[PDB]
Amino acid sequence: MPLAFCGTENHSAAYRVDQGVLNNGCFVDALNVVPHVFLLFITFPILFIGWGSQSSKVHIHHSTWLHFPGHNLRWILTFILLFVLVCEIAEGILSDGVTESRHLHLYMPAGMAFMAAITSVVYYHNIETSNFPKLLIALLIYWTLAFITKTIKFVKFYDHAIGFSQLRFCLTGLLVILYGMLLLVEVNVIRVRRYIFFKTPREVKPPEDLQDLGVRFLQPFVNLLSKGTYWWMNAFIKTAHKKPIDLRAIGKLPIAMRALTNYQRLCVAFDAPQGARAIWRALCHAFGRRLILSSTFRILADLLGFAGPLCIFGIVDHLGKENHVFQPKTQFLGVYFVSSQEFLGNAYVLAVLLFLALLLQRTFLQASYYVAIETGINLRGAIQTKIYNKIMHLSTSNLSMGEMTAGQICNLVAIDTNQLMWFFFLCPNLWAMPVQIIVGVILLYYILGVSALIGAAVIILLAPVQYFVATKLSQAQRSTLEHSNERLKQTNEMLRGMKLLKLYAWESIFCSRVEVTRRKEMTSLRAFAVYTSISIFMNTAIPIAAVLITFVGHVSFFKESDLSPSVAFASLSLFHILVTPLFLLSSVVRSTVKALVSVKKLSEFLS
Amino acid sequence: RARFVSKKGNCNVAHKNIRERGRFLQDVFTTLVDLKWPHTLLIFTMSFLCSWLLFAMVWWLIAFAHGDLAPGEGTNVPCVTSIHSFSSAFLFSIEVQVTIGFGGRMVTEECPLAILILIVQNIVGLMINAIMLGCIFMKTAQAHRRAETLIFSKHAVITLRHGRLCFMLRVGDLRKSMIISATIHMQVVRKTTSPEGEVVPLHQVDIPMENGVGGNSIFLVAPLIIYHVIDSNSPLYDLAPSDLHHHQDLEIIVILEGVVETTGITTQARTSYLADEILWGQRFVPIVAEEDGRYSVDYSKFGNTVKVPTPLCTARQLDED
Amino acid sequence: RARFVSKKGNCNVAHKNIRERGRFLQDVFTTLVDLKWPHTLLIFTMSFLCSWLLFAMVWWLIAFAHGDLAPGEGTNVPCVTSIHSFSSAFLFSIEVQVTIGFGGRMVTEECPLAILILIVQNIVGLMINAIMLGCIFMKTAQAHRRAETLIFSKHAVITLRHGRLCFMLRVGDLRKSMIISATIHMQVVRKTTSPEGEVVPLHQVDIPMENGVGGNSIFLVAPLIIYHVIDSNSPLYDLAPSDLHHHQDLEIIVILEGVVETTGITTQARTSYLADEILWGQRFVPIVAEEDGRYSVDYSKFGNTVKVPTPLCTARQLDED
Amino acid sequence: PWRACTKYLSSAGILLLSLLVFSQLLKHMVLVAIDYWLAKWTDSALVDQSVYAMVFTLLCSLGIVLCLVTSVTVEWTGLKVAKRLHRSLLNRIILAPMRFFETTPLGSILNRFSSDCNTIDQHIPSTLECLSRSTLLCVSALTVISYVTPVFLVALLPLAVVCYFIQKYFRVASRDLQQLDDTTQLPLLSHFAETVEGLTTIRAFRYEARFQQKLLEYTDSNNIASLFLTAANRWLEVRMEYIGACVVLIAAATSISNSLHRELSAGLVGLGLTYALMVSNYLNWMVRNLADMEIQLGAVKRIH
Ligand SMILES: CCCCC/C=C/C/C=C\C/C=C/C/C=C/CCCC(=O)O[C@H](COC(=O)CCCCCCCCCCCCCCCCC)COP(=O)(O)O[C@@H]1[C@H](O)[C@H](O)[C@@H](OP(=O)(O)O)[C@H](OP(=O)(O)O)[C@H]1O
Ligand SMILES: CCCCC/C=C/C/C=C\C/C=C/C/C=C/CCCC(=O)O[C@H](COC(=O)CCCCCCCCCCCCCCCCC)COP(=O)(O)O[C@@H]1[C@H](O)[C@H](O)[C@@H](OP(=O)(O)O)[C@H](OP(=O)(O)O)[C@H]1O
Ligand SMILES: CCCCC/C=C/C/C=C\C/C=C/C/C=C\CCCC(=O)O[C@H](COC(=O)CCCCCCCCCCCCCCCCC)COP(=O)(O)O[C@@H]1[C@H](O)[C@H](O)[C@@H](OP(=O)(O)O)[C@H](OP(=O)(O)O)[C@H]1O
Ligand SMILES: *[C@@H]1O[C@H](CO)[C@@H](O)[C@H](O)[C@H]1NC(C)=O
Ligand SMILES: [K+]
Ligand SMILES: [K+]
Ligand SMILES: [K+]
Ligand SMILES: [K+]
């Protein structure tokens, strides 16, 4: 039984092409390899000739590039395409293992589609960087061929009464959609960036920025993948080890977010009084269309967070069940089809799906962080411009004193606008916490029932405790600062003058009350320290209590069946990914009230 | 420091920030021949191997579509005889394209599409055969490797000849064959600032060599002394022996271009003499003798120099006496 | 207006009313190689395909005349074995001419005419194979495509150098390989009327460039500035900054000719600077720098110019002061 | 860096420092056992201390109490070493030569006496405690995977090597970015300090456009330092997450293979996978504290 594309069953009767070639399942699958080998045989000669040929003495670096229309959509579709093909390869392998012979047509065409899909992304990116809109025809031909050959396979399933119950029917259907949409994207760039059919090759309109302006922060210009992996910074850090950085290598800020363009929109939104309520409306209008983007990534990252425990729950149940019996129980044209329920039954499938689920989740939460921070510092620059504008011109007839208060203004831009900035750093965090919490407890209730409710309730009740000790900790430092300032003031009376204070030999008695001035502050340090230690075992040791109140409660008050490893670890995993997003909840609440004071302070000091 | 041209003729210049990749893509053949040998072998191998695979799938596919892969009974004439698996199709593709043609796997007259592919493969096979075989011979028969047997002196010499200072060097040819239409070009490479303030980092000033009928023409069969007379209009007219130290920013480039007699392709041999590689109080030693009825050139003493009494003044001061 | 030579080197001249078509017919090979690639592929394809068809009819005909096409009984040795229809004859012609030789269809020793055709087809097959394969390699290895990597400046400069106005431009080579025996020719193209009344619509006046040993010879490994000193006998001796507008009828052509080191075939790179493409009060910015032990050329700043103080008077007025 | 950190144990003495090491190491070991017994109990649940498994709960009850005392054991000792550092600096300050004080700027001493000691008091013991638990949990997380499958550790070591290189290139770049962010912070607020005084000397005399635009030079220099620092952190986390996510796949695939290769395992496999998911999360935390400890490492340099 050697390797066979169509499998060696009967007398290799699966190779017969009577009653039409397109009615032979293997031939249609073989026909689907045609687009993929076409893409490899076209792009590889082109990629090698223009990109991989000259090196080590000929540098063709492009420090300027314009994305083709639909760049973001194309990368999104390919990532979906790459994910679906992985499912199709995994689906094929499960069906293939049942038969005595290996049917290569089940996964090899999908496996070779995976290489072509990656190559298309690589081919497109190199073309897109160096314009070459004419070379997009190769992708245009590839998508058309792939769409045609996947439509044929999908139609033949419909003829052979292959419903949505068979997974391979669904995966083929999605590929028709994904190839169809990618075909439209290629048509879209022809319309927007006419380069072949029309006789007017519309001007590329090079970006206003990204010229030789010294811009080194390439985050808003790199491709979508590099935005999610920060690959552009990798080269910058690769040389930062060799040479210390400076304000010159760090370059200039991109035009869209230097300082003024942030403030320019800020004052534009102000057109609508200038009270606290009016301030929030402008900030929401100016920095809301970008803030929701960070929250949306955070929400999706939170949703995929549960994909950890769910895969943990799925893998253990189908692993501890033993049996090891695998049968698709669905054979069409002599080919086994695995149902959707059976597909999510194999441990290997769950492990691979979990691995892909994590990568999308980890990237999304990182993407949520940067967008919030980038928007946060964008507001910080705009706010500082507004504050400076308030102090400067357009502030005629100053009220009295030394401009209200010299000290107040100094800390207003020092430790008050930062609180507003840090509010936007954690603004999605507060919004996304309830969504993760409510789904987390619900999933716990569907795993351990009553016992999970008690374990989740105490963790929820810990949030007021964490805020309660936060106020005590904050007050302790406030009392400490009153004594520390006296200790600092007493010490900083001849400390700077110790060059001449020691000459008079009067420091022998001066450095005798230092302990007294420090003990009055150390006793406040003890109050601050005990509150910190209180928060430690109220945070580090609380997961242990949560596990016990859920575990031993299965018989103390629940009286149910013996817990399985799957339900225990799934709740343990859910608890682990739930306790950690609680410390931020206490912190964001403390930051929320702190920022609310700061914005009120800015609003009242605005006029 | 850095050398504009290495002692072996390699040019130490790196081209950076080129934003015209379209030009390289439009010039494919020059790129193909300019590749290093390990890449040339890979491209040569992958050009034929991928061609065989591409048509192997086509031969395998049409045999599938015709039902030839199915062993069910007989009484059917296949498109190509004795094709069973992809390996048979791949072997058949090699036989057709390399024109081996064993005949166990033979095209039959039942499938006009198969005859169509046979026409296409042969036409495509010939074009790949023509370009790749010709490309690898051009890669082999490049004339730059002939420049490895053209040797220059390791040191240049400035000395008095016929009452005037002359920048002299020796160039020889190791091979028995000739360099047809050999020409010598000598240039001075240094940073020169014009009075208007313009600065040229590598201003190449072309200096003449004394030939008697002009210049840029030699008959290189025995090692010649190529020398440039330093006079009022020479760039070295203000060169002093104190300037001949390592950090001077003064480089002399010698270029020898001619048609290789054996091959017929023009070549080019380059060398460079920095400031510290030029010797002031020296003179080349004769290396040409007469043994029996045939002149013998002793290449062991090729670069040897012997000190001679030479004034330590510049060529400008020599005219002023 | 119209350009005599495009910025990319294309010559915008159309030859009209040629009544000597016999000259083109008497020169066939140059026509064959000068065809565009889609025509070259068609001729290459149709040369072999028609050759196979022509002998296919001959093989089919003599098999007919010998009775081989008739399946009546056996005991008769055919001219060529296993030939039944024209498709069999066509397949046999491909096997013989491309020298595949499967052997299912084989020449036998019964028909001397068949042996005669086998001799004729092989001799004709070799000549077509020799000419066409060699022709398509010459088409591939043309040296004009190498000129696509010889960039010129997009603007010329007429500044002050060493006290005299100089028409300057920059020429560079993107490839690592060299241009052997590179020569620069600069010409002024405009309509000049002699005092006798003769008018030359495109009188090409050849202007020299300062080289120091004559001219028409450069060593292009780094981007050089090629400049022509405007003096009494120069054609630009009466050129004023007010004349550098679009509608002036004044064009400068730069020609770079040399042997491609990689290939061995002489190439030619051309460019033209109209009146409005020449900048008066400018000067090229240096781009050659030294990084570590290897000079680095920054091709991003290739054509950039910086304004410098330059007199607004013609070179004629400069001598008159 | 950290080479001079071999000192500073004198403030912690020997008995106090060893107690923290014994306590901190104990807590992680018990938690490893607590999860291990949970896996064995659940494995034994589906079928001999199988009766109601309160012994494991009792072992879990002492851990939190042992964790409770560890929370204050490392916190109380941190206060005393601050007192000893305060006492040691005071004696040196009194005995500091006047001629040396005159030669020196005498301002760094005041900053080191006040600013550095304040960081040592309220921050360093907390950061060191957080670093210790993070750098120990990952090692414990790198042993439970070994216990569930001794085959995973074959490729675990090369991944940790890649993690070392990534961390080594981040701390160098991040610290320099921290310096620039600190460098650009001073002119921004000082300009505002110069803005509140002499504003009438600026409004009347000057158009004020130069001064306002001069601030934009300060803010831009400040903003770029902030986002470059942010981007370096985001760069660090992503490559750390991908290493962690890759670890999960290797651990899961190896663990599944053993069960299907007649190597039993059963519910014991599920225990390791939960730790494997935490490996990525704790990997970021360990690197975060290591950079913070560098400030502590430099803090003793001003005192040494
Ligand atoms: C019981 C069993 C017994 C076994 C016994 C073993 C038996 C082993 C069997 C047979 C092989 C031994 C064959 C002996 C052959 C000599 C070939 C003669 C042609 C030839 O010239 O090739 C030679 C030798 O290399 C090869 O052999 C390269 C030959 C081409 C390789 C093609 C292989 C195809 C790969 C396909 C495989 C994959 C196919 C996949 C199949 C599946 C598909 C479905 C190439 O060597 P070279 O000298 O020309 O190259 C050097 C070198 O590359 C330097 O880098 C280069 O420096 P630069 O150019 O300056 O940068 C030198 O230049 P210089 O002249 O200035 O110094 C060159 O001189
Ligand atoms: C179940 C079935 C499955 C089917 C799957 C499909 C399977 C499809 C199967 C097999 C074919 C795909 C083959 C893949 C081949 C690559 C060939 C490699 C050789 C090769 O180089 O050919 C390439 C590709 O074109 C062809 O392919 C042309 C190849 C020659 C075609 C000969 C065909 C013979 C026709 C006979 C038919 C009629 C026969 C009648 C029979 C009956 C007789 C009785 C030629 O392309 P090129 O790049 O050299 O040409 C361009 C182009 O022409 C531009 O116009 C030209 O501009 P200019 O020269 O400046 O005017 C460009 O010049 P630049 O360099 O400056 O940019 C050239 O670069
Ligand atoms: C059944 C499955 C069938 C699978 C096989 C398919 C068989 C079917 C076969 C052939 C057809 C599929 C053909 C792909 C289709 C359409 C491509 C059209 C785009 C195109 O025109 O190609 C060229 C690139 O030249 C090459 O590299 C072209 C290089 C050759 C391209 C084909 C490679 C041939 C080898 C492939 C075979 C390999 C076989 C083994 C290797 C044989 C080696 C002899 C365009 O690219 P470009 O860079 O020249 O154009 C740029 C660009 O357009 C700019 O916007 C434009 O303005 P500026 O840059 O500002 O001046 C400039 O335009 P110009 O080109 O006019 O200067 C250029 O700068
Ligand atoms: C062929 O195999 C199929 C199994 O799908 C079954 O009908 C039987 O075993 C064989 N039938 C014939 C007619 O050979
Ligand atoms: K044969
Ligand atoms: K042959
Ligand atoms: K043969
Ligand atoms: K035979």
Residue numbers in the entry:
A (entry chain E): 1 to 272, 281 to 615
B (entry chain A), C (entry chain B): 32 to 352
D (entry chain E): 997 to 1043, 1060 to 1316
What is written in the article reporting this PDB entry?
ATP-sensitive potassium (KATP) channels, composed of four pore-lining Kir6.2 subunits and four regulatory sulfonylurea receptor 1 (SUR1) subunits, control insulin secretion in pancreatic β-cells. KATP channel opening is stimulated by PIP2 and inhibited by ATP. Mutations that increase channel opening by PIP2 reduce ATP inhibition and cause neonatal diabetes. In addition to adenine nucleotides-dependent regulation, membrane phosphoinositides participate in the gating activation of KATP channels, as they do all other eukaryotic Kir channels.
At each Kir6.2-SUR1 interface, one PIP2 molecule is bound within the site that is conserved among Kir channels (referred to as the canonical site), and a second PIP2 molecule is at an adjacent site, stacked within the regulatory interface between Kir6.2 and SUR1-TMD0 (referred to as the non-canonical site). The phosphate groups are coordinated directly by Kir6.2 residues R176 and K67 while Kir6.2-W68 forms close interaction with the inositol ring, although K170, which is about 4.5 Å away and H175, which is about 5.5 Å away, are also in close proximity. Here, the PIP2 head group interacts with surrounding residues including K39 and Q57 of Kir6.2, and N131, F132, P133, and K134 of SUR1. The structure of the PIP2-bound SUR1/Kir6.2Q52R channel has an open Kir6.2 inner helix gate. Clear cryoEM density shows rotation of the Kir6.2-F168 side chains away from the pore’s center, thus causing a dilated pore size. Specifically, the sidechains of Kir6.2-K39 and R50 flip away from ATP-interacting positions, with the K39 sidechain now coordinating PIP2 at the non-canonical site; moreover, the sidechain of Kir6.2-E51 forms a salt bridge with R54 to partially occlude the ATP binding pocket.
